[PDB]
Symmetry: C7
Subunit: 242 residues, 7 copies
Amino acid sequence: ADSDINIKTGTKTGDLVTYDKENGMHKKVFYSFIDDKNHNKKLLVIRTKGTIAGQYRVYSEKSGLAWPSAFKVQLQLPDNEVAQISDYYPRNSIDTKVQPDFKTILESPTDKKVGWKVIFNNMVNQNWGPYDRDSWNPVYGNQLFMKTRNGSMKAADNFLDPNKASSLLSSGFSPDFATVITMDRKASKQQTNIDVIYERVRDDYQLHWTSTNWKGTNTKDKWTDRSSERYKIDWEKEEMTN
Amino acid sequence: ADSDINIKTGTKTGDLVTYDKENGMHKKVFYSFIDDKNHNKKLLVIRTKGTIAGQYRVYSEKSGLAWPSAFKVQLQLPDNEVAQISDYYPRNSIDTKVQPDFKTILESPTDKKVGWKVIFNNMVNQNWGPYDRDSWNPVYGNQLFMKTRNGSMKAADNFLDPNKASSLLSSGFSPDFATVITMDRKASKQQTNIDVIYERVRDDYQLHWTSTNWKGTNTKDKWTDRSSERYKIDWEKEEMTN
Amino acid sequence: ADSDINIKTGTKTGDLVTYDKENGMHKKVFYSFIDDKNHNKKLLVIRTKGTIAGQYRVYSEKSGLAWPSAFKVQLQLPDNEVAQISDYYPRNSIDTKVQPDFKTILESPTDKKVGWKVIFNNMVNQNWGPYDRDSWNPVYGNQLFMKTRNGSMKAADNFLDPNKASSLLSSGFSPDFATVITMDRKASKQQTNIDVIYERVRDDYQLHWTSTNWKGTNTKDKWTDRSSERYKIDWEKEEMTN
Amino acid sequence: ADSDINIKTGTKTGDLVTYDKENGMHKKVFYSFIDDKNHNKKLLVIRTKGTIAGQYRVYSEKSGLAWPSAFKVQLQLPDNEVAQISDYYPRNSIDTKVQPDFKTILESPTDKKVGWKVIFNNMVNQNWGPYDRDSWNPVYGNQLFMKTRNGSMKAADNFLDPNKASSLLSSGFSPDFATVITMDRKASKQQTNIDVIYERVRDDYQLHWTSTNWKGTNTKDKWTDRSSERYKIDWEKEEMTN
Amino acid sequence: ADSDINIKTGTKTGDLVTYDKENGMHKKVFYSFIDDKNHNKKLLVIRTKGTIAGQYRVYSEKSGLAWPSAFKVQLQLPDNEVAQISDYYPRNSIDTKVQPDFKTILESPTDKKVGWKVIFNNMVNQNWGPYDRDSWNPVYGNQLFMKTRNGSMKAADNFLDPNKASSLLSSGFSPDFATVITMDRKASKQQTNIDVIYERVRDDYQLHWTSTNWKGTNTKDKWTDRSSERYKIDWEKEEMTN
Amino acid sequence: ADSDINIKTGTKTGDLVTYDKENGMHKKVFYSFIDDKNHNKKLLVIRTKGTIAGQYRVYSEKSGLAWPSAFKVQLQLPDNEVAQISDYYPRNSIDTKVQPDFKTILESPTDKKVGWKVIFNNMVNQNWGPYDRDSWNPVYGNQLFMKTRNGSMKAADNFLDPNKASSLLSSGFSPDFATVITMDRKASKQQTNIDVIYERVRDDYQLHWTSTNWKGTNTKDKWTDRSSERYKIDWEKEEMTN
Amino acid sequence: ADSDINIKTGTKTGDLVTYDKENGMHKKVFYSFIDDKNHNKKLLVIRTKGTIAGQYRVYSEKSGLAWPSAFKVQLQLPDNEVAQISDYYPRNSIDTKVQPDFKTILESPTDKKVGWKVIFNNMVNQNWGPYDRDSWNPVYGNQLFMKTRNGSMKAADNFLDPNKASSLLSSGFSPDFATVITMDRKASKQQTNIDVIYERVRDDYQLHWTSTNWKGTNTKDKWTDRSSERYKIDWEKEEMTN
C-alpha cells in the first residue's frame, strides 16, 4: 500500500462516565490530540466505550424477554453549528468472501448523523441454526433464548440461561466503535453540540406451547430503552466534558 | 523484494467535507508532503473517503429499488493544465488463484482519467448463490433484495431488509481508494483542475409475481445520481480546498 | 484501524498477595502509572491474578465432588465514594463465527460493579461430548469427573483423576482479567473502597449407579467458597495495599 | 538466512509519465540512490509502473476482440555503451508446490536484454475451467470472453462484459516489475541508452456459431501494439528523464 | 489488550548447576533484576532448566521399565520466612478448543507451594492410540514402550527402542518452567529458603505374554527418584547460590 | 532459540557481471564487510546471482530438446592457498514432513569444494504427474516438454511451449545461493583463488511416435554447457573483481 | 510469557574449520561474548556447524551402502576440570500433537556429556511409507535406497540415486545445534577440555533378490566413522582454537 505508491512513508487525553438507573447503560468517551504544525487543523476522536446491559430478564409472567435486539449508537449533531463529520471507523467493510453473530453496520451516514446498529445476527442455540436478530420461525418463532426443547418445569423457569446464550445478550455488548468530525482551522467560532442517542432496541421472545411442540413469537421493538443522552464537547479547551 | 535486490533498503496534511441533500453523498480527501531535498518534486495523494449512501429504498409503489449498482469515483482533469497522473492504488491486482462481493476495478486509466468502479459482485441471499451487480436470472431476475421466497404480506412491505442484505447496499460503501498525479519541479506554472465525478450508478430490482413463483427484473442504470462535484486542488499552498 | 482513520498515530508499579487457609485461594493485583502532562487524570489498573484452587476432592463418602463451577471475581465498590468504573478488559467479545471449555463472561456491569464469571463450559471426557458447567444428562447427569464407564473398584476410588480432567478443575484457574476505574483530576477528595468478592462457585457431581448403567447428579451451588476479601486501594500514594 | 550464516547482519528520487493516443499506454519509472562511501558504485532501479490498457473492445463487426494476450516489457540497451545488467526482480521463482491467472515470466535474459512477459494464464469464465492466454478449445476455441452459452441478442452485444472478465483484460494490467544495471565506478565515461519496448501482444477471440453450439477461434498476435518507447537515462545527474 | 484499554502502553543475572550420580538429574536456575525507582520492590525469577534423565532402561530381568511417569518440580518454602509466592508461568491455560503428549499442569498452588507435574500424556506407538502416563489397557496394559507386536527374540531385547519412543522418555525432559515470589520492600529482614523437590515419578511397564497375545502391566510409582535438592536464594546480594 | 538459551541476545559492497555468447549465461556476485573490533577476522559472502538460460530450443530436426537438467554452481578452490570454506546457506534442510519442482541440493561439500545442484524435480504437465529431472517413463519417456497428447501438426512445431512449462526451463533459473570461506586473521599471506564451475547440465527430451501412442526418450547429459568461469577474489582490497 | 509475568521485560566472535580426508567430515564452531557488568560470569556458545558427508556410495560389489544412519555430535569433557554444562538448544521439545524425516534427539545429557543423535526418521521412497533409520521390513528389509522395484540393469547400477533420496543421505547433514557450559566467575583457575566425538553412524542397505521379489537387509553399525576430533577451548583469551 504505502510502499505500493513508492512513498517514503510520511503520510492530551481524558475520559468520561455516566450511568442510568432506570435503563442501566454505561457510557464513555476518550480523546487525543497532537500539536502538529504541519497538519491543517485539530482532530478529536470519539470512542463509544460503555456497557449497554442486555437486561436479559423475564419481566412479565410464554415469557416476555427484554433482550437487546440491536444496541445502536449515533453521534448526531445540530445543524446550526459549523462542524462536519469525517471518519467512522469501523466502516461497513466490503462483504468479503463466515457469518458473525453481531454484524456491525454503519447506518447510512449523512454528513451530520453517523450511527451504527451493532445488530444481533446468527446465534447457535443448543447445536442448531443461525437465529439472527429478527430471527423468526414458523413454529419456534424467534429462537434467541429457547433453554431447551423438552422442558418439564415452570415456564418462568424455562428460559434460556444467560450463560449459555451469546455472552452479549446476557450482560450486554460494550460498543467498540469510533468516529471523528472536522472543521477549518481559521474560523473565528468554535462551538458544537452532540446527541449520542444511545439505543438498546429491546425485543421480545415469547415461547408459547401448542400442546404438540413449543413455538416462539417476537414483538420487535416492543420497547426501546433509547435513553438519549446528549453529550457536550469542549473543543477549544482540548477536553471532552458531559 | 528489497532484500531480493540486495539493496541497503533506501529507495503537511488537511481534510475536506461536503454533502448533497438531493442525492445524499459525503465526500472527503486527505493529503501529505515531505520536504525531501533528495526527492525530485512534490507529491500529493488523494484519498476518496466519503459515504455514497445506497438510498436502498422503495421509491415507487413489484418494487423499484434504488440501490447502488456500482459506486464509481473518477479523478478526471482538464487537458490544458500541465499535470500528469502517476499512481492509482488500489490497482487491478493480478487475479490470483475467492469471489468477493464488491470486486473493485480500476477502469482503463488513460494518462488523464483514472476511475474505479467498486462494483457489486456476488452477494449470498438467504443461503443461496452469488448474485453480482448485473445479477439477472431467468425466473427471479436480479436477486439483490428478495426478502424471502414465500411472502404473504403487502409487496411494498416485502422487500429484503437492509440489515440482512450486504451492508453496503443498505448504508452505502465508503470509498477506500487513492491515486496521485505528477509533474516536473522546475516548471514556472503550477495550476491544475479536477473533476471527481462521484457516481452512484443506481439500478432497479423489480420482483414481479407470476402466480406460480416470484420473479425479478432489473432496469440497469434506470438512474445515475452521478452528482459530479468537481474539486479544486491548491498545490503551491500545500493545501487542498474545494 | 489507526491508519484507517489516517491519524499520525498519537492517540510506578507494585504487587500484593494473600491466602485463605480454610478456602485456599491466592489473590494478587498489579498497577502502573505515567506522569503524562497531556493526559487528563490518573489511571490505575487491576490485575486479578491469583489461584482459586479447585479443591477437586471427594469430601463426602456416589461421591460429592467439590469442584469449581465458575470462579467469579467482582471488583465492587461502595456508593458514597466519588469514583467511577471505566474499562473491563476482557469484554464479552462479539461471539464471532469453536466452543472453548471456559467461556469467560463479563456479567452485566453496572457503573459500580463489574464482575466476570469465568465459567466451566464444555469439557471432553474420555473422548466424548461437551459437558459445560451446568452439564447435566438424563442418565449420566453432570459429566465433569466420570473416571470411566465400566469401573470395578471402590466408588470412592472411582472418580475422574484430576490429571485427565480439565487442568483447571484439578488445580484451579488463575484469573487473567483486568479493569480500571476513573475520576476527574481536580476533585479535592480522593478516597475509594473495593469489595473484590472472590468466588469459587462450588458444585457437586454425584455418580449414582442404577444397577444397569451409571448415572450422575449435580447439586448446583451446594456450597460457594465466596471468600469475600475486600481490598484497599491507596490512590494518592500511587500504591495498592490491602 | 542472515542469521543462518551467523553474520551480525550488515550485508534522490524522481518520476516520469507519458501516454500514447493511438495505442493508449501509460508509462512510468522511479529511482533511488544512497551516498554509501562503503558501497562500490552507483545503483539505479527501474520500476515499470504504468497502464497498458487492454482495449478490450469489439473493433470489427463472431467478434474480433482486441485483448491483451501478454503485456510485455523489456528494458533493452545498445551494445556499444559500457553498461551491464544485474538484477531482475521479480525472477522466475522456483515453481514451488495454485495456478495464477497471470504467471509473470522473466524471458531468458541475456546480459543486455531482460524482459518479462506478464502473460494471461488461466481465467475462470462463468464457473468453468482455466483458459490461459493461448487458451484454445476444439469447440469453444479460446475462452477468454464468452459472455454466456445460450445468448439470444445481437452477437455484437454478446461479448463477455469487461466487468465479469479478469480485471486485467477490461482495464489493462499495471506492470509491477523492476530491474537494475551495473558498471564499475572508476570509468571515465558514463553514457547509456534504453529501449523499453512496451508491448501489448494483442490477440483475437472469435466466437463463431455452428448452429448446434457456439465455438471460438483465436488469431494469436493478430496485432501487437508494441509501441516501442525508448527511454533516456541521465545517470551522472542522478535523474531519469525521457 | 493494552490498546484495548486505550493506555499509552506503560504498564544482574547468574546461573547454577548440580548433578546427582545415583539418580542422574541436572538442575539449573537463572535470575534478573532492574533498578526501577518507579517499581515497588525487588523481583527474582526462577527458571527450572535442567535435565531429568528418563533412565529408560531395563533394570530387572516381562521387563521392568524405569521410565519418567511425570517429571515434577516444586519450589516449596518454609513457613516462618516472610516471603510470598506470586506468579507461576506457565499456568494451567484455559483448556481451549489437540491432545499434547506432555500436558504440563500447575498443581493446585497454595500461597507457599507451587509445583508443576509435566506429566506424560498420549504418545502414539507404532501408528496407534494415545497412551497417556497412566495409560493402562485390559490386554496390552500400559503401552509406552511396546517395541512391536510380533517379536521373536529375547524379551530383554524386545523393549521399545528409546529412539522411536517419545524423545522425552529416552533422554528425559528438560523443564522449561518458571515462577516468582514477592515481599514488601521496607521490611527490615530478608532471609528466605527453598525446597525444590525435583521429582522423577518413576513407573514400570511390564509386557507379560499370555501365549495368545502380549499384554502389559504398570506398577505406578514403583519408585520415585524424588531427589529433593533444597536450594538457597541469596536475595540481598542479588545472586542465587546453592 | 536465542531467548531459549536466555542470552541477552548479542551473538563495503560491490558487484560483478559477465556473459557467454556461445553458452549464454549471466554471472554475478555481491559482498559485504563490517569493521568489528570484537569479531575475530574478515568475512566475505558470495552470492551466486545470475541467469543460466535454459536455451529451451529445438536444436535438431522426435525433437532434441536442449533443456537445463540441473543448473549447478560450485565455488571450488586450489589446494595450495591457505583459505578454508565455512558456511553454505542454503543447506540441505532436514527433509521435514510438499514436493517442490526444483529441490536444491548442497552436493556433499568437502572442505574445499561446495556446490549445489539446483535440480529439476517434479513438474506438472497438462494436469498430470510429477516429472522430475530424470523423469523417464516406459511409454512417454521423460515428460518435461510434451506440448500435448493428440497433436496433428509438424513435430518440430509440436514441442511444449516455454510459456506453459516450468518458468525455469523456458528462461533459465537465476541462482539464489550463497556461501562463505574463512581463515585466521594474523596470517602474513592472503591470496586465494576460485573455480566457479557454472554448469547447465543439458539433457534431451525425444518424443518418438509408435503409431499407437507417443513416447519419450531422454539422453541424459547429452551435453553440458559447463562453461567453467574461474573467478578472482581480491580479499585485502575489500573488493571482488573477476 | 514475559508479559504474562508482567515484567518490564529486562531478563567477540570467531570461527574454526578442519576436514578429514579418510572419513570426509567438515567441522566448525562460532562464539560470542558481552561485557555485561550486571551478568554474573562469562558465557561461551558452541555451534556444531559442519558437514558430515553421507558418503552414500556402493563400496562393495545386493550392495553394501555406506549411508549415515545417525550423524551424532557430543561435546564431552574430562572430569577433573572445574567446568559445568548448562544449556543444550535444541532440546527434546515436548512431542506436541507430523513425522519429520530426521527427528533430532538430545541423548540423555549428564552434567558432563550432552550429545545429539540427529537420526534418520521416516523417508518416503517412490511414493510409499515412512522408512526411518532402523527401517527394516520382512521382505524389502530396510528401505532407504531402493532405486525402484522392477529394475533390469546391473545391480551395482541399481541403487537409489542420491538425488531422489533424502538430500541428507546423498550429501550429508550439516549439524545446526548448539549448547553452552558454565562456571563461577571468581575461581582462580580457568582451564577446560573438550571431546567433540563427531559421529557418522554408518549403516548398510543390502537389496538381495529372492527370484520372486526384491528384498532388503540392514547391517546396523557395520561401521562408524566416529572420527573423534577433540577440540580445545581457550576461554580466558576469549577465543576458541583447535
